[PDB]
Design a protein around this ligand. Structure first.
Ligand SMILES: CCCCCCCCCCCCCCCCCC(=O)OC[C@H](CO[C@@H]1O[C@H](CO[C@H]2O[C@H](CO)[C@H](O)[C@H](O)[C@H]2O)[C@H](O)[C@H](O)[C@H]1O)OC(=O)CCCCCCCCCCCCCCCCC
Ligand SMILES: CCCCCCCCCCCCCCCCCC(=O)OC[C@H](CO[C@@H]1O[C@H](CO[C@H]2O[C@H](CO)[C@H](O)[C@H](O)[C@H]2O)[C@H](O)[C@H](O)[C@H]1O)OC(=O)CCCCCCCCCCCCCCCCC
Ligand code: CLA
Ligand code: CLA
Ligand code: CLA
Ligand code: CLA
Ligand code: CLA
Ligand code: HEC
Ligand SMILES: CC1=C(/C=C/C(C)=C/C=C/C(C)=C/C=C/C=C(C)/C=C/C=C(C)/C=C/C2=C(C)CCCC2(C)C)C(C)(C)CCC1
Ligand SMILES: CC1=C(/C=C/C(C)=C/C=C/C(C)=C/C=C/C=C(C)/C=C/C=C(C)/C=C/C2=C(C)CCCC2(C)C)C(C)(C)CCC1
Ligand SMILES: CC1=C(/C=C/C(C)=C/C=C/C(C)=C/C=C/C=C(C)/C=C/C=C(C)/C=C/C2=C(C)CCCC2(C)C)C(C)(C)CCC1
Ligand SMILES: CCCCCCCS[C@@H]1O[C@H](CO)[C@@H](O)[C@H](O)[C@H]1O
Ligand SMILES: [Cl-]
Lengths: 342, 34, 451, 137, 81, 334
């Protein structure tokens, strides 16, 4: 049977400069539109009607301050389809109401699905194990938990991260002030995975490069390697002795080493995603009850935990009126928390 | 010897064509006054 | 194309300047051409600064780092650091710019036209990195040149107009240094001071007599050691401790420059004698003390007894004691009580800040100076918005002290990395394994196992 | 919203005469204010004495009144304390003290009017932000 | 190799540069005019420097209803005189 | 074989289970001193007057802390940058009140860790290795110098050094953002690219090599038994890995030279973390992140807020609340 399905399969899987595949039918439009929506919005589109903010090069923002901002809080969790009942097919209104945000987020979500299907599809054609696709589940878990689950637990898309450099920084600081997110052990595990992964990257790359065999005569050692050679290009035995004597322990199994390099950052990102799922519901690690009982009763008891809450209280009161304009917070000067003199 | 219009050709131009248009638009923005 | 590709030289293009290691004549060219770049920037940057300079604005409001260096030496300024004549700034710039053409010419000639190696052409200018006698002789010549350079500063100070003295009675002025400090207990006593707070090692030099006398001692020492290294050859203990190779010599200099960069970072951050605040702006400690002074003055004018005003913590609102008893400014500036500056010392008594002087002897010029320094604190954004990080746009300011300290910390750090890179490589190349482990001779395979 | 002649019309003196500035004067006032005054007065506050700001309501109750061009131009020649009782040229920049405040040496009478006009117009634009401090940033 | 013509072949060919010495500036100028004619403002609904606020108002025209948001923006746009 | 040569051959011996070496002769006592003091102080030290205002902060477990809130508290702001060894105090009780332990721990630790870096160079020399592993370690080492030594120097007090504790670290980060807007500084942004990218390339390299392991085992056993320590032949097929990853992106975006691949793995996080350390080290001298507060202005001159102005609101809340009793004058200039 060589019907139209099989002929199409043939064409999709040709060895070309950019492999396409069946997964490419999903991947390429959705990735292209998500990127094009971000460039279109950061270049031309305002956030005046949803946030009270300028957010495009057209308005005078720079690369750090442009964003595609989230819709207004009054939209709730509306899909904000261009043909939906809010924009009613009007492209200009759609832009002013924040339709580009759901546009980028939804096409991005399906684009990420398509990239992971591409990893599976190419792996199956070339004949390798699909561990690259498995590792890519961690970026997907982060994207889905931060950009979809988190706002879906909150009141509206408005509280999702906006797509911009400084807008994401605001997201970090909101999470400190409102959620005490540094205190959350799921974030802590994520930090461990990311910093541990950067550590392993640096140390493995440096170790290989400084245990190389002399396999050529030049002072540039890069040339003395052939992709099809059978021999290891560096000495695992010497590397093992160096680290055992420097650090006490060392890798001895090169397959374990590289699985571990996969395991550490992937697991960290997965842990951080779980904590953000909790924050969707305000299920925070905000307090230690035992500390609060002591501190309420004993005005001489002070720790770095109590010092940080005072900082969080400053963040909430001083940023909330501007950051949440739909709430209409009016905080007179006299109610603002402030230390002496400042 | 080689073709001119390939998949690679399309992929190159769906990126490069809007890029140049956007760069001209952003260059014009540097002369806008309030 | 002698040694101008990877196959002949062994070095790829991205390490292309390593192809010059044994080509003394081209290596001379690279060094001379580069010195021309240094002199070019000094000349051109001065002219740029001068073209952009308004004499009625303080230097530190105008982004100037070179003119302050010239003014400190006594050229173009008078009482209080006011600019009286911009012509010396012009001269210094022009002469450096003109000289860079001479150096660029010589550098380009030796680099591409002259003899690639100098050993065949001249045995005086030729050298082998491994010739310990020749290398210390070249070192000796350059120590004599450096020693002459330190004496040129002494000559300026003692015979050719003097130096700007921020501490001079009457507000600061150019002063001729007639009695430079020569007592070696003073000069070398600076070298044994702790580098910690209240001591500050050599960064604490606070008078021009010590600065000039230290350069007399440094001048002689360099000239003597230069003669010593011309007439001698390294001793046996020295021979066994060092690696003797071009890359090794480079690595030692990289370590030395890194150390000097870190010292310069602290000098411009704390010292207000050889970096006068009139020209560079107040130091961080200085501006913080100046705020305390400003509000003490304001509140005392409104009738407050600043000596007995208890602040919210129980410590004095305006005045308190240091851990050793001295009367100092209160608030968070308690950390800065080691600061000394000409606008503040008239209020100082044997026990520190004197309450009677505070009550009666504060002059309007001190109030002016403290308000100016408080409002030119060395804080500011990377796009030169002056003030704390939360300040709005309006003031286009970043202190010269911040520019000079941040740039030289970054440079000193990378030069420490360069020392480690090149010292480790020099050791490995001398011993013969900088290209990798010999498979048939892997040292670990001949060692007993650890367990 | 636009910078209109209405916005640029400010009191010339205490008797109720107004003067209408040009956009060029206003913009020149801003640049000269930044040059000579903003190191202490950014945003209409006073960093070395926060009790006194540059709000029009505060300037109206100065002695003599400073909420008009002539009062402000006189202040830049011969500044006084808030109650007019003392002359503070020795510690505040002015033409009288241009020898010790050198940035004042190249200010002309026309410059003083432009700076004055900036101080009087900015609150009409910024509202509470002018003289309000960090609370309104 | 995958059969397409090498990029280094193409971009050093006179024919490439004959074509793209026109198409590249033409696109740039089209982008410039999209802004200089003011068309970008109207396509995307972005305020000009003089249309963020009415002359004396200092409140944001913030959308506060879901299904009448389109009419709210149109109402805000009228009130610009 | 005299006694000094015997000692030198033991110090530098490649047969010790842990290499000592000349750097190790300084490393071992300083690290032991810092470790013992830290453990004792973390468990039992009494509260410390960090900001010099007679307002002691409790950092130890016995005084009401858990693992997350506990810290060794930086030394008093009244001390500034003065050297405060035990023998400069009238008593141990004074020394403890004023944060003496902090100074003892970080000075011994920074010495020991610098010698740890030298020790990495030294052993590579004794084994016939290339020497630059220590250059990779200089990135985390420079970062420790930045938050424990350089930042105190520029701000004039070890009381603004980073606390030795988990919540103390967060306090340090929040106040740093308030006073330098570090999120808006490109060196911190390069640092984030360094560690985000380092974690990405970590999982990337590990997944690709794991994906191309050569079948050497049955399904009931760990594939890790298919590699044998010291074997001569490579354990995965780099050509198949390149063939997969070249098609995932495009062919020329993929490495086929294992040496340059591994050099890139070394360089990206190390260079990134160097920039992070330089960010902290240069914000130590108050060259702060980009300030775009009120940068966008409308035709009338109304401020149009950007996301930068929202960040500024958060920074103000941190600024006005931190060290709430420590300021008497309106500007926090250090
Ligand atoms: C893994 C890899 C996956 C790869 C990526 C896949 C991408 C797929 C893309 C799908 C996008 C889903 C969009 C869902 C939008 C949504 O939910 O929109 C939400 C709506 C509900 O609408 C909300 O309803 C709320 C409650 O209102 C109710 O109560 C009100 C107050 O009392 C009034 O009475 C009101 O009339 C009444 O309706 C508020 O009105 C909100 O403003 C309004 O947005 O639900 C709905 O559409 C449907 C609700 C049922 C289905 C929910 C399952 C899917 C989401 C699971 C996430 C769990 C999150 C919980 C927190 C954790
Ligand atoms: C070969 C190597 C061998 C190593 C030797 C190890 C021995 C100890 C090393 C030094 C440790 C220094 C710690 C404290 C540094 C410091 O507080 O430095 C400050 C001092 C200056 O001291 C200050 O000096 C001031 C002097 O100013 C005084 O005098 C002035 C005169 O105008 C003014 O009047 C001013 O107002 C007045 O106060 C005051 O005394 C201050 O209180 C005092 O704090 O700097 C100085 O002494 C000089 C600068 C020292 C170098 C700075 C260290 C940088 C290290 C970077 C490492 C990076 C590593 C990366 C790894 C990868
Ligand atoms: C200060 C920076 C500096 C200096 C002084 C040098 C100097 C040198 N390099 Mg190095 N190099 C540098 C940076 C520098 N390099 C950088 C950044 C890289 C990385 C790209 C390299 C990579 C590199 C490689 C791969 C090689 C060198 C080589 C050389 C030597 C011979 C160059 C030659 O033959 O070119 C010939 C070039 C020309 C004839 C073109 C014009 C060159 C002239 C000098 C330009 C001067 C213009 C100037 C404005 C004129 C002023 C004249 C006026 C004063 C009268 C020379 C000593 C070569 C070498 O080692 O040989 C043994 C070599 O193979 N370099
Ligand atoms: C006096 C200082 C000095 C001197 C004479 C040398 C000399 C040498 N170095 Mg060393 N090095 C130094 C300092 C120095 N280095 C420092 C401070 C570092 C730490 C970063 C290094 C790190 C280093 C490494 C890692 C290596 C060398 C190597 C070498 C050899 C080849 C150099 C070359 O051809 O580069 C060619 C120059 C380039 C390819 C250009 C580099 C471009 C830089 C990164 C741009 C920097 C940005 C700029 C400052 C600002 C932006 C500009 C932009 C906006 C336009 C040569 C002997 C190589 C070697 O070991 O050979 C034996 C080598 O692998 N050096
Ligand atoms: C010692 C070095 C030094 C210092 C402290 C200063 C300081 C200053 N300069 Mg000067 N200048 C310098 C060197 C220096 N400059 C050099 C080399 C040039 C020629 C390019 C100039 C030409 C110059 C001009 C034309 C002007 C200044 C101006 C100024 C002032 C404002 C600077 C500013 O806004 O920066 C902006 C900040 C940056 C651009 C950040 C640069 C970030 C770099 C690229 C990172 C590099 C890191 C490292 C080196 C690379 C490592 C790579 C790694 C892989 C190893 C300030 C006083 C201005 C002024 O006010 O004049 C009166 C002005 O108009 N300078
Ligand atoms: C330190 C830098 C330096 C060094 C070590 C050399 C060394 C050499 N040069 Mg080169 N050269 C240099 C810089 C340098 N030059 C400069 C700056 C220029 C442009 C002026 C040249 C242009 C040049 C040419 C055209 C030629 C040489 C030649 C030579 C070789 C023979 C020189 C001789 O015997 O003169 C004998 C010594 C003297 C005549 C004494 C001169 C005293 C000077 C001019 C007065 C100033 C002295 C004082 C220390 C200067 C302070 C400078 C400081 C402020 C920066 C010798 C290898 C020759 C060569 O390569 O033959 C094949 C050759 O033909 N050089
Ligand atoms: C750039 C300047 C320079 C350089 C590169 C050299 C280089 C050299 N000198 Mg020369 N020397 C110089 C200037 C210089 N000298 C000057 C100006 C004088 C006159 C004072 C001398 C007088 C001199 C004598 C009498 C001797 C040398 C010798 C040597 C050789 C051995 C160096 C050595 O082991 O140091 C290593 C340093 C030490 C062993 C010092 C002790 C180690 C202490 C504990 C380190 C302390 C470091 C600490 C951080 C210090 C911080 C600052 C401190 C002052 C507080 C070496 C070739 C030796 C030689 O072989 O002569 C032929 C020798 O006997 N030199
Ligand atoms: C710091 C060194 C200052 C500079 C520079 C400028 N001003 Fe100032 N101003 C300063 C102080 C400490 C005070 C209070 C003086 C007092 O004791 O009363 C003032 C006051 C004014 C006022 C009066 C404000 C009011 O009465 O409400 C005005 C109108 C004023 N200053 C204007 C002004 C101008 C125009 C400046 C640039 C030429 C300028 N100031 C600079 C501190 C400082
Ligand atoms: C949204 C939407 C859509 C779409 C659209 C699109 C698809 C677009 C695209 C667009 C695009 C596609 C654009 C682009 C642009 C680009 C740009 C704008 C770029 C720039 C660049 C630059 C600027 C660069 C820079 C740099 C760097 C980065 C680094 C290196 C160096 C340099 C400096 C060069 C549709 C219609 C469907 C529908 C509706 C909605
Ligand atoms: C070798 C080499 C190199 C390098 C080179 C160099 C580094 C060079 C240098 C050069 C130089 C370093 C040059 C210089 C020159 C200069 C000049 C030419 C000048 C002139 C001047 C003038 C003409 C002036 C004028 C004036 C006056 C007099 C007055 C005022 C005004 C004015 C300014 C107008 C490279 C890397 C490329 C590579 C290859 C090899
Ligand atoms: C000018 C002046 C002055 C003076 C100064 C002086 C007098 C100085 C001196 C200086 C000096 C006099 C210095 C010295 C230095 C030294 C060093 C820096 C050393 C080093 C060493 C080393 C590095 C070694 C090493 C080693 C070892 C340890 C082991 C064996 C091997 C080897 C060799 C490697 C004063 C301050 C008064 C004032 C101001 C001005
Ligand atoms: C959804 C796609 C399912 C394949 S459907 C399949 O396609 C064949 C082409 O090979 C035809 O020959 C056949 O009649 C048809 O049923
Ligand atoms: Cl204070």
């Amino acid at each position: 049977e060589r019907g139209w399905f099989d002929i199409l399969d043939d064409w999709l899987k040709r060895d070309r400069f950019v492999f396409v595949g069946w997964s490419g039918i999903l991947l390429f439009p959705c990735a292209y539109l998500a990127l094009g929506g971000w460039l279109t919005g950061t270049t031309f589109v305002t956030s005046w009607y949803t946030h009270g903010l300028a957010s495009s090069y057209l308005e005078g923002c720079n690369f750090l301050t442009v964003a595609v901002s989230t819709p207004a809080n009054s939209m709730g969790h509306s899909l904000l389809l261009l043909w939906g009942p809010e924009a009613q097919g009007d492209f200009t209104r759609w832009c002013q109401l924040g339709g580009l945000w759901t546009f980028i987020a939804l096409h991005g979500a399906f684009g990420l699905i398509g990239f992971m299907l591409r990893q599976f599809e190419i792996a199956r054609l070339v004949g390798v194990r699909p561990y690259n696709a498995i590792a890519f589940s961690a970026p997907i878990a982060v994207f889905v938990s931060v950009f979809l689950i988190y706002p879906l637990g909150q009141s509206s898309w408005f509280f999702a991260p906006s797509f911009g450099v400084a807008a994401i920084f605001r997201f970090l600081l909101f999470f400190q002030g409102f959620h005490n997110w540094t205190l959350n052990p799921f974030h802590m595990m994520g930090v461990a995975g990311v910093l541990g992964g950067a550590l392993l990257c640096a140390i493995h790359g440096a170790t290989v490069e400084n245990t190389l065999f002399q396999d050529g005569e030049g002072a540039s050692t890069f040339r003395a390697f052939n992709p099809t050679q059978a021999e290891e290009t560096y000495s695992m035995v010497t590397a093992n002795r160096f680290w055992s004597q420097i650090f006490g322990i060392a890798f001895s199994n090169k397959r374990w080493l590289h699985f571990f390099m996969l395991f550490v950052p992937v697991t960290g990102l997965w842990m951080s995603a779980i904590g953000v799922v909790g924050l969707a519901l305000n299920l925070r690690s905000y307090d230690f009850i035992s500390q609060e009982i002591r501190a309420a009763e004993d005005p001489e008891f002070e720790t770095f935990y109590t010092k940080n809450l005072l900082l969080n209280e400053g963040i909430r009161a001083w940023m909330a009126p501007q950051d949440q304009p739909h709430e209409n917070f009016v905080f007179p000067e006299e109610v603002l928390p402030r230390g002496n003199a400042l | 010897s080689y073709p001119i219009f390939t998949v690679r050709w399309v992929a190159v131009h769906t990126l490069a064509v809007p890029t140049i248009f956007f760069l001209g638009a952003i260059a014009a923005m540097q002369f806008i006054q309030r | 194309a002698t040694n101008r590709d990877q196959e002949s030289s062994g070095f790829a293009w991205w390490a292309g300047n390593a192809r010059l290691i044994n080509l003394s004549g081209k290596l001379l060219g690279a060094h001379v051409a580069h010195a021309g770049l240094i002199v070019f920037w000094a000349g051109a940057m001065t002219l740029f600064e001068l073209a952009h300079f308004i004499p009625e604005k303080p230097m530190y409001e105008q982004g100037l780092i070179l003119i302050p260096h010239i003014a400190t030496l006594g050229w173009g300024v008078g009482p209080g650091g006011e600019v009286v004549d911009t012509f010396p700034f012009f001269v210094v710039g022009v002469v450096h710019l003109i000289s860079s053409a001479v150096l660029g010419f010589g550098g380009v000639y030796h680099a591409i036209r002259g003899p690639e190696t100098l050993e065949e052409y001249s045995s005086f200018f030729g050298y082998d990195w491994k010739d310990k006698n020749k290398m210390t002789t070249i070192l000796g010549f350059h120590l004599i040149v450096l020693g002459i350079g330190a004496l040129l500063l002494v000559a300026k100070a003692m015979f050719f107009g003097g130096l700007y003295d921020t501490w001079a009675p009457g507000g600061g002025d150019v002063r001729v240094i007639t009695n430079p400090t020569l007592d070696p207990r003073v000069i070398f006593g600076y070298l044994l001071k702790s580098p910690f707070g209240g001591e500050g090692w050599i960064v604490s030099v606070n008078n021009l007599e010590d600065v000039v006398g230290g350069h007399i001692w440094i001048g002689l020492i360099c000239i003597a050691g230069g003669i010593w290294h011309i007439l001698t050859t390294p001793f046996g203990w020295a021979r066994r401790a060092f690696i003797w190779s071009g890359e090794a010599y480079l690595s030692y200099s990289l370590g030395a420059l890194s150390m000097m960069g870190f010292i310069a970072t602290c000098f411009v951050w704390f010292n207000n004698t050889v970096y006068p605040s009139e020209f560079y702006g107040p130091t961080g400690p200085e501006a913080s003390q100046a705020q305390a002074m400003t509000f003490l003055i304001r509140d005392q004018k409104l009738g407050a007894n600043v000596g007995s005003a208890q602040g919210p913590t129980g410590l004095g609102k305006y005045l308190m004691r240091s851990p050793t008893g001295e009367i100092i400014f209160g608030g968070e500036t308690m950390r800065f009580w080691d600061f000394r500056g000409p606008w503040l010392e008239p209020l100082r008594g044997p026990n520190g800040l004197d309450l009677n002087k505070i009550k009666n002897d504060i002059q309007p010029w001190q109030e002016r100076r403290a308000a100016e320094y408080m409002t030119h604190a060395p804080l500011g954004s990377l796009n030169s918005v002056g003030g704390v990080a939360t300040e709005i746009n309006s003031v286009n300011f970043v202190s010269p002290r911040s520019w000079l300290a941040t740039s030289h910390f970054v440079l000193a750090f990378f030069f420490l990395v360069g020392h480690l890179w090149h010292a480790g490589r020099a050791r490995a190349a001398a011993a013969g394994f900088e290209k990798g482990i010999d498979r048939e001779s892997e040292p670990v395979l001949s060692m007993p196992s650890l367990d | 919203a636009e910078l209109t002649p209405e916005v640029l019309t400010v009191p010339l003196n205490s008797e109720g005469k107004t003067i209408t500035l040009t956009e060029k004067q206003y913009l020149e006032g801003k640049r000269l204010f930044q040059y000579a005054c903003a190191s202490c007065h950014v945003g209409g506050i006073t960093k070395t004495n926060p009790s006194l700001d540059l709000r029009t309501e505060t300037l109206a109750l100065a002695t003599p009144p400073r909420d008009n061009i002539e009062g402000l131009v006189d202040y830049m020649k011969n500044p006084t304390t808030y109650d007019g009782e003392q002359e503070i040229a020795e510690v505040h920049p002015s033409l009288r003290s241009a020898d010790i405040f050198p940035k004042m040496r190249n200010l002309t009478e026309k410059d003083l009017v432009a700076i004055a006009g900036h101080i009087l117009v900015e609150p009409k634009i910024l509202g509470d932000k002018w003289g309000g401090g960090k609370v309104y940033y | 190799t995958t059969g397409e013509r090498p990029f280094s072949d193409i971009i050093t060919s006179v024919r490439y540069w004959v074509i793209h010495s026109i198409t590249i500036p033409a696109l740039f100028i089209a982008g410039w005019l999209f802004v200089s004619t003011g068309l970008a403002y109207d396509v995307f609904g972005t305020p000009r420097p003089d249309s963020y606020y009415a002359q004396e108002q200092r409140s944001i025209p913030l959308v506060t209803d879901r299904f009448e948001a389109k009419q709210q923006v149109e109402t805000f746009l009228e009130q610009l005189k | 074989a005299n006694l000094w040569e015997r000692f030198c051959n033991w110090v530098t011996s490649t047969d010790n289970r842990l290499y000592v070496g000349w750097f190790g002769v300084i490393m071992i006592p300083t690290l032991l001193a810092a470790t013992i003091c830290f453990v004792i102080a973390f468990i039992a030290a009494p509260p410390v007057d960090i900001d010099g205002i007679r307002e002691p902060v409790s950092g130890s477990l016995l005084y009401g802390n858990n693992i997350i809130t506990g810290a060794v508290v930086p030394s008093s702001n009244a001390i500034g940058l003065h050297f405060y060894p035990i023998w400069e105090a009238a008593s141990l009780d004074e020394w403890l009140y004023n944060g003496g332990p902090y100074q003892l721990i970080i000075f011994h630790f920074l010495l020991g860790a610098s010698c740890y870096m030298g020790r990495q160079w030294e052993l590579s020399y004794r084994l016939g290795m290339r020497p630059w592993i220590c250059v990779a370690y200089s990135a985390p080492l420079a970062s420790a110098f930045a938050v424990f030594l350089i930042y105190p120097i520029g701000q004039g007090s070890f009381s603004d050094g980073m606390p030795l504790g988990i919540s103390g670290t967060f306090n340090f980060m929040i106040v740093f953002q308030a006073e330098h807007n570090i999120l808006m500084h490109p060196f911190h942004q390069l640092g984030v690219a360094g560690v985000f990218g380092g974690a990405l390339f970590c999982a990337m390299h590990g997944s690709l090599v794991t994906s191309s392991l050569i079948r050497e085992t049955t399904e009931t056993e760990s594939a890790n038994y298919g590699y044998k320590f010291g074997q001569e032949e490579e354990t995965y097929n780099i050509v198949a890995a390149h063939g997969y990853f070249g098609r995932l992106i495009f062919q020329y975006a993929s490495f086929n030279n294992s040496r340059s691949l591994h050099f890139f793995l070394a360089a990206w996080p190390v260079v990134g973390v160097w920039f992070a350390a330089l960010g902290i080290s240069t914000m130590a001298f108050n060259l702060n992140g980009f300030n775009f507060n009120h940068s966008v202005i409308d035709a009338k001159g109304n401020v149009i807020n950007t996301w930068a102005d929202i960040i500024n609101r958060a920074n103000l809340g941190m600024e006005v609340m931190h060290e709430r009793n420590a300021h008497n004058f309106p500007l926090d200039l250090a």
